[PDB]
Amino acid sequence: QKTKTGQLAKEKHEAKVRNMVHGVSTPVVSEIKDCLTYRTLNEALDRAVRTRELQVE
Amino acid sequence: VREIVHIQAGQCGNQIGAKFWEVISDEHGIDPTGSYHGDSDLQLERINVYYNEATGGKYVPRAILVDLEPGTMDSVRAGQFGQLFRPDNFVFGQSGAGNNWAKGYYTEGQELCESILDVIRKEAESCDCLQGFQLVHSLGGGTGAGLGTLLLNKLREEYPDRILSTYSIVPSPKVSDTVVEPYNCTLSVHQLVESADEVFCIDNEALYDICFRTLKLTTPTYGDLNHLVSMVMSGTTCALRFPGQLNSDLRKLAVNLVPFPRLHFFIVGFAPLTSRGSQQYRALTVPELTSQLFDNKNMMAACDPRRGVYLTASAHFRGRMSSKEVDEQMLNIQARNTSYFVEWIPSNVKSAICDIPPRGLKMAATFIGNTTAFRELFTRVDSQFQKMYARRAFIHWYVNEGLETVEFDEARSNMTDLIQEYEMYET
Amino acid sequence: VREIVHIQAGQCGNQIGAKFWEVISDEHGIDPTGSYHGDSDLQLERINVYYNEATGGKYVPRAILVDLEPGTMDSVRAGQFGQLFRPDNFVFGQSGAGNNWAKGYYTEGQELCESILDVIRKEAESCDCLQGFQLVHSLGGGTGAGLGTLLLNKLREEYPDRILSTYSIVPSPKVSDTVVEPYNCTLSVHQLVESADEVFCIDNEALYDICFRTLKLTTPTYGDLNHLVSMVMSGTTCALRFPGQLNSDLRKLAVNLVPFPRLHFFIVGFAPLTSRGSQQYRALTVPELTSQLFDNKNMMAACDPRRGVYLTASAHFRGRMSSKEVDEQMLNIQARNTSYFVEWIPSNVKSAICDIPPRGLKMAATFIGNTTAFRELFTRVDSQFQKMYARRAFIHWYVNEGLETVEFDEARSNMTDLIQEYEMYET
Amino acid sequence: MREVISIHVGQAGVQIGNGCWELYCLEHGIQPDGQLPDAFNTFFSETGAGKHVPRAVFVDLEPTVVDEVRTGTYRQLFHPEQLISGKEDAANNYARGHYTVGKEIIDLTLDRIRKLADQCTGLQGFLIFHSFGGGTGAGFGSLLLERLSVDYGKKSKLEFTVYPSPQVSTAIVEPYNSILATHSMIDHSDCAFMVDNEALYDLCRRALDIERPTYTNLNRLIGQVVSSLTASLRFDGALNVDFTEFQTNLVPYARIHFPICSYAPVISAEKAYHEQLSVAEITNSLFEPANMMVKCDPRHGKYMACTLLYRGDVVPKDVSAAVATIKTKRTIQFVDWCPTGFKMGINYQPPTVVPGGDLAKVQRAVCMLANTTAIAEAWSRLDHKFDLMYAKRAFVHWYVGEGMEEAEFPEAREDLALLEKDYDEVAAES
Amino acid sequence: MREVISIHVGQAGVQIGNGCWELYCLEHGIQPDGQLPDAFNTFFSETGAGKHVPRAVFVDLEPTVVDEVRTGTYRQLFHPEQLISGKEDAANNYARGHYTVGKEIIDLTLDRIRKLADQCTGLQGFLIFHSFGGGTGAGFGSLLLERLSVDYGKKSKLEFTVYPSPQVSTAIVEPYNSILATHSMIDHSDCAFMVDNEALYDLCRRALDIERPTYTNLNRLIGQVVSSLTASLRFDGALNVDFTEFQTNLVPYARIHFPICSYAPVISAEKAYHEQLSVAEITNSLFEPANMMVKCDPRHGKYMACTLLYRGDVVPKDVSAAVATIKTKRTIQFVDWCPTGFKMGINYQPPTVVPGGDLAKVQRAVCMLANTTAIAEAWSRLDHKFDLMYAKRAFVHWYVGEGMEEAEFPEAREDLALLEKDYDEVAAES
Numbered sequence A: 001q002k003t004k005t006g007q008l009a010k011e012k013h014e015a016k017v018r019n020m021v022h023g024v025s026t027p028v029v030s031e032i033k034d035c036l037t038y039r040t041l042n043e044a045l046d047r048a049v050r051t052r053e054l055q056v057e
Numbered sequence B, C: 001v002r003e004i005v006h007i008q009a010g011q012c013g014n015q016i017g018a019k020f021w022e023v024i025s026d027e028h029g030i031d032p033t034g035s036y037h038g039d040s041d042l043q044l045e046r047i048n049v050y051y052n053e054a055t056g057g058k059y060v061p062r063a064i065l066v067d068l069e070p071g072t073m074d075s076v077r078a079g080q081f082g083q084l085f086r087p088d089n090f091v092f093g094q095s096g097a098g099n100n101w102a103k104g105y106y107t108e109g110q111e112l113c114e115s116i117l118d119v120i121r122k123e124a125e126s127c128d129c130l131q132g133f134q135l136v137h138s139l140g141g142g143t144g145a146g147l148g149t150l151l152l153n154k155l156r157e158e159y160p161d162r163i164l165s166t167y168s169i170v171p172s173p174k175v176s177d178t179v180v181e182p183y184n185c186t187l188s189v190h191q192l193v194e195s196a197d198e199v200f201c202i203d204n205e206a207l208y209d210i211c212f213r214t215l216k217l218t219t220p221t222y223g224d225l226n227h228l229v230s231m232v233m234s235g236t237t238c239a240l241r242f243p244g245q246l247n248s249d250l251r252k253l254a255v256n257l258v259p260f261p262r263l264h265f266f267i268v269g270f271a272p273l274t275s276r277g278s279q280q281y282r283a284l285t286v287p288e289l290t291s292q293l294f295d296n297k298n299m300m301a302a303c304d305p306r307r308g309v310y311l312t313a314s315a316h317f318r319g320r321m322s323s324k325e326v327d328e329q330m331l332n333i334q335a336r337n338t339s340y341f342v343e344w345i346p347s348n349v350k351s352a353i354c355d356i357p358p359r360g361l362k363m364a365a366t367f368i369g370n371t372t373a374f375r376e377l378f379t380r381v382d383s384q385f386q387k388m389y390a391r392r393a394f395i396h397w398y399v400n401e402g403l404e405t406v407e408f409d410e411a412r413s414n415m416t417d418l419i420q421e422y423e424m425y426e427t
Numbered sequence D, E: 001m002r003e004v005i006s007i008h009v010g011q012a013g014v015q016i017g018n019g020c021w022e023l024y025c026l027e028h029g030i031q032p033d034g035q036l037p038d039a040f041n042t043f044f045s046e047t048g049a050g051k052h053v054p055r056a057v058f059v060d061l062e063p064t065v066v067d068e069v070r071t072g073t074y075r076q077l078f079h080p081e082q083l084i085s086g087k088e089d090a091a092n093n094y095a096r097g098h099y100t101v102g103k104e105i106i107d108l109t110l111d112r113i114r115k116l117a118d119q120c121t122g123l124q125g126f127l128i129f130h131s132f133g134g135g136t137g138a139g140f141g142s143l144l145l146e147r148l149s150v151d152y153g154k155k156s157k158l159e160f161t162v163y164p165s166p167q168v169s170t171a172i173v174e175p176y177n178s179i180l181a182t183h184s185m186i187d188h189s190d191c192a193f194m195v196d197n198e199a200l201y202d203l204c205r206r207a208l209d210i211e212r213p214t215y216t217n218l219n220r221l222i223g224q225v226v227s228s229l230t231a232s233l234r235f236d237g238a239l240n241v242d243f244t245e246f247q248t249n250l251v252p253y254a255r256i257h258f259p260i261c262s263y264a265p266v267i268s269a270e271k272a273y274h275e276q277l278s279v280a281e282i283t284n285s286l287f288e289p290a291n292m293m294v295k296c297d298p299r300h301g302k303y304m305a306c307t308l309l310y311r312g313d314v315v316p317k318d319v320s321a322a323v324a325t326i327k328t329k330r331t332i333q334f335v336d337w338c339p340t341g342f343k344m345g346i347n348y349q350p351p352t353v354v355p356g357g358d359l360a361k362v363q364r365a366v367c368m369l370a371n372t373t374a375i376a377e378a379w380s381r382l383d384h385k386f387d388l389m390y391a392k393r394a395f396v397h398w399y400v401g402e403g404m405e406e407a408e409f410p411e412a413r414e415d416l417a418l419l420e421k422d423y424d425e426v427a428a429e430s
């Protein structure tokens, strides 16, 4: 016989009940680096890459 | 050796103090359990400036926590560095502060004044080489605005010779957090003018401005604002703890910056400042530091110096660097910008050098200055307070505690005299 | 040493600038990440002219990117060499200018000009000795023309001594991109005549013709069109960047070529230009370049000098060559074509030799000269400007921005005066 | 530490309290039986053996409403002491519940309140819920506040009342009870909040997707406002605001003690997926007249006080952006003598949800309290209503026989007029 | 960053919008539910999680058209607040749709469009679709522009309307509605584009290979023109053109905004296999009189405006040659007042094809927007039709009885006559 079944009504509404939480906007940004400039870290890797390629390779 | 004592107010003061003692802990290398774990012998040279040593190697700060309600003390105790403070160095009330200046100063101020002065005597009498007092408070509140000035007057009566240097946060020009703040600032400054020796002004909205313009902080938190304030106020006392090629102590700073007893309000600023991205592109040098220090986008206070003229100003440098370079840059910056300075004080600027820079930066500088631009800040509260003058009815909330209405007129008359004093020294 | 600051305005300026710094980086041998990876110490003699040095062996170009909308800036950031430019150098608005010159000058130019001026002053005072400014812009109307001339005026007010050398792409006078060009071109000429020192005129149509004729390019790409202009720019400053047997700076070029203050517009050309296939069979010598330089087809401005007469001519060379050959070839080209030069100026032709040639070519040259053939371009745009101003169509947009039609009459009066000055000096 | 006491009178107060204590039990994680499967001391008492008790007293002149709690699932939590109920309701008569019957049980109520006051070490405020139109709510509440005013004196007495709707009225003699209660509150109450049922019905119909709400939905919306109000003391926050701080900021005059309440976001369990819920967005929704918990247009007057409390991830940086954006609105008028205008509070506790709740599980929320001259619009309707029947003396004899002296009716009428004149004079710029 | 908002009015406007957003979602790779299987911020907003929302509002006085979208597959994408449905339509009466019924819903519609703009930071421009024949489209559009003109001031208001066909018609009162609208957009509209269904049918039959098109096929053709116009704002190109550029270039005066549109190639999906269709090929096809979607004679219409937006692999050199070749044609006579006369936009984004679509998969395509004096031919036809019915007062009673004053008809009649006088004066040489 005919087969026509689909329950969008629950799927839309039960999901809309659960995962309501919107807009996480995580405030994980920290200042402690800018006062502790990592430029020294980036140049440390820059020299390390420079020395490895120019000398070793 | 050259001791200082640190005092904090209820919510703003203790939170800033909490971050400050983290900052000093990193600088001197104090482990979060109070035991020294640094890497240089220079750290222990002048640790007596800020710390006492207990039997066992556990180091305890010269700090006292004052509040009218226990809300902030619980937060500080549970904090990361809450162990460091002395268990007997917590003084708190058992009533709502109510953000009221008159209520805090009179009602609970007299109840707590006797105890807090006795607790302060523990640190005051146990340090032989003491020269210093360091108060942290907010002017728009109820515990630092009122009770802070009560402590300031009592300490002045007890110890006239010691320096009374305080750090203050001013209500914001656009919107501050509380409605009655025009009253609180006007009452507090009256005591501050006569009693305090050195006053530092910091604005929250300028701190937001610096975060967006320079640091590119998409989400600046309260810790970020406290870190900038802690950076500046830690740099002031760096000369007392570390060697340098030209020292500048608190008294040197006061004598150079203060030409007259009442005009002693200071603006603060720190360099270098840069964001995550462009810090890698910066050629960090002394002329770059000079550019940042005098830059109109790096002061913690939202007051444009270009609208007025400058009184004496000072800057303190940390790091291994040339002396001639500092002298030339300050000589050039003075000759380049003649109009902003005053002729009747030759050599408007002062310089200082310290050997050891802060961690992570090869060289840093601290800017402290005085100018006529403060009059705009006083005009802001004066205009707001003038509209509050029709709300002398609203002052009925204040008189219920015991204040009389004529005090407000006395305070505003003092503001009018101070504003006219700055105007006449502009000429 | 002797520094120059580079400024790029709008859509046309930034794309030319992207190619220009690609050429300069190839010249000096700077890796796209800012590292030096060249093989010549002579590249390091005058790297300070165009570059600042950041700590850690990285070089930051003296380039400021200016626009009113972020579309071009996003394209440049995603580019191959976008990492080189300092992030804080990027200054942009949040509005399509609309190419209304009144809007781009008064409505949005004034607001942005304050930020651009301070960013300019950042690099302006960071060099040991500034000598001149380099600007790339098109005479469109929105930002390259309106804001470009505003910044040119402000820079003239700030630095009267320095040379404000601007590169201009005039709207192509047979096919072009907007109906409102002659309004913008007429006003831009009015501002550029008084405030600019050297103005270089470039036509896209001549660039198309050059590519099809000499380069044999089936589909002339905007990359190659900008590449030719970038090559001409680099040759102009090559004398300052490398030593030579006879040096010539911008001031030498400005003094020599310009007889009278207003008549200072220049046509430019480059040689050798050769197709990708037939370069193997070419016997490149000095006479070959002289034929190419003075050829009426290798010129990238669509105004045939054979119609007019020449006033001044300059020749630049790159490579090792005999000075007699340049001197003899130049005299011969002067002596034969006596019908194209003014009688009252003997030795109308100037020379210069640079030691190091551009990469890939064993020998190269650059042609810059001044002629009366510019009367055609001004007459063409004047006729177009005359028609619309008679109808007063499209002016309602400019009126809404506050520009009154009497400004157009003054601009055309200046334009007509320049045409008459060229006409009378031809005799 | 710092303790608060809640007392509920007149049906509506109790059922609102039933919603509130349901909300607080879930918020802190307390089962209805009182055991655990924090900051309890702010509202609950640890009695030992793991059981907790709320700091509240329920008093009603009829047993029906209280018997609902006694026979309900909540019964194991409340002390049988706290469930006082009378033998005979006041039946919509202010005089009957104040003189003839109120004095029969008023002494009993105060003794139980004082007994809990012994256990409150840092008692700094009270929370009282009224229904102005009710006979028990108005008559008994007036006597209780008058007694409590002299019992303790300098202690915060915050009220949460329900104003009669502009058109919806369930009591015919409601204006009689409303004015007499207002005349008694105006001298003792520190600050009384204002809400009405009709605005609750309209907001629940438009914002929430409820075709036909009941009293339960209205009470839960009220309970969320109460929870947001009390969250400053209960939990750590970047900007904690004390009860006395609300008293100083909210009522900047002598006797103006009636602010209006607002709450955002109030969104369906369905739409908010499609929306940004930004703090700037929720802040702008607060000031729109459609969201007011009182049916009065702010455009008929001006503002002189504002208080915003943020429950959620709201970073202080954006809060400054939101309030600055609000000041640019021309549709919002601020009086000249209040340049500051605002009191902010930021608390880290997210909003609390209820099983089978009518609201979405939003991450962040803000509760707004505002004092404005627009409440004078509500006064004029009550004044005109009372004058119409009293001109023909429609219900004088019922009150007079129950202990009312006829001279009291004109006295309360003039007291309301003084309130109207005081409100109008404050609105005038000086 | 840079943002646009769209409004859809009436029966016709919603259906065109239905086709457009399927085209955008397929172009941007967005499922109908809003989750991905960039330049989205120009038209869409990210509502957290992984769902998007369109920057559009659908408004009509009848629920039938809106309910179709609510029941369609795309119902998940749209926000239910964005779908506003009226109660009873204007019944093809301008007076009824402007005053009696339009004013009932105008305030609600204006609130949502302004509320949506609060999330719209880099915003300059609006898109409003109208049905000139219908009463609601003409009536509501005039009132909507009147409000938006004063609320926002100097903002780019651009309209995509359907002009009445010269002979094909479906409403007898169509000329009345068109003339009353033309009086209002002539002052409240920055620049509005129009096409007529008669030429759309003819182009869909000759060049395209559909024997009997429906409204769905015509809407798809309209959507491609809109997509080409908005292509510059979403993708990089050698010559990007902003909204302000279109307004500056296309009009030489204030009241002469009305341009005409042309899209090439319009070849079918099956006939397309034989032609390469280079730049010169498509450029020549644009200027054919038969390729207009407005049935106007280019012989009578001089050109004083042109805009050539190309999409696909296009080299600027070929365009310059193609434009130069076009200018040499004697039949295409530009006005003396327009020497340069061209704006061109080359964009690297190729066009898009829709499953079940009716368009060829062309590698490159060009959309054309120009202003010509031939539009005055259409005004004369509309003017005569209005005069014939108004001479004997054919339908005055319906408009008068719906709140519209009788004297407005000669006022709008004179407003058209001035517009035609302006076109004749501007077209004349000098």
Ligand SMILES: Nc1nc2c(ncn2[C@@H]2O[C@H](COP(=O)(O)OP(=O)(O)OP(=O)(O)O)[C@@H](O)[C@H]2O)c(=O)[nH]1
Pocket: D009, D010, D011, D012, D015, D016, D061, D089, D090, D091, D092, D093, D097, D131, D132, D133, D134, D135, D136, D137, D138, D162, D170, D171, D197, D215, D216, D218, D219
């Ligand atoms: N928000 C809200 N309001 C309610 C609720 N129940 C009642 N009310 C309102 O509060 C008023 C209660 O007053 P009454 O009906 O007189 O009951 P009462 O307070 O006990 O007064 P009496 O029984 O007459 O002595 C009603 O008029 C309602 O308008 C409720 O559940 N929620």
Ligand SMILES: Nc1nc2c(ncn2[C@@H]2O[C@H](COP(=O)(O)OP(=O)(O)OP(=O)(O)O)[C@@H](O)[C@H]2O)c(=O)[nH]1
Pocket: E009, E010, E011, E012, E013, E015, E016, E089, E090, E091, E092, E093, E097, E131, E132, E133, E134, E135, E136, E137, E138, E162, E170, E171, E197, E215, E216, E218, E219
């Ligand atoms: N191109 C196109 N035009 C349409 C379509 N549907 C309607 N129209 C036009 O719309 C006109 C009639 O107006 P309606 O579509 O009913 O819109 P309306 O303004 O709401 O009309 P009323 O509801 O009667 O007030 C007709 O003359 C058509 O030209 C369509 O699907 N495609």
Ligand SMILES: Nc1nc2c(ncn2[C@@H]2O[C@H](COP(=O)(O)OP(=O)(O)O)[C@@H](O)[C@H]2O)c(=O)[nH]1
Pocket: B009, B010, B011, B012, B013, B014, B015, B016, B099, B136, B137, B138, B139, B140, B141, B142, B143, B144, B145, B169, B176, B177, B178, B204, B222, B225, B226
């Ligand atoms: N920058 C900053 N300001 C703060 C902080 N905590 C509180 N404040 C400010 O302090 C004000 C409250 O004043 P109050 O705490 O009574 O001042 P106190 O008594 O001196 O501590 C608020 O308006 C805040 O703006 C903080 O951690 N950082």
Ligand SMILES: Nc1nc2c(ncn2[C@@H]2O[C@H](COP(=O)(O)OP(=O)(O)O)[C@@H](O)[C@H]2O)c(=O)[nH]1
Pocket: C009, C010, C011, C012, C013, C015, C016, C097, C099, C138, C139, C140, C141, C142, C143, C144, C145, C146, C169, C177, C178, C204, C222, C223, C225, C226, E238
């Ligand atoms: N030679 C060359 N010209 C370009 C290029 N890109 C754009 N243009 C031209 O620059 C003009 C646009 O100038 P624009 O930056 O918009 O100036 P503005 O409108 O005044 O701000 C157009 O007429 C183009 O013809 C390019 O890559 N090379």
Ligand SMILES: [Mg+2]
Pocket: D009, D010, D011, D012, D013, D130, D131, D134, D137
């Ligand atoms: Mg009740």
Ligand SMILES: [Mg+2]
Pocket: E010, E011, E012, E089, E134, E135, E136, E137
């Ligand atoms: Mg319709």
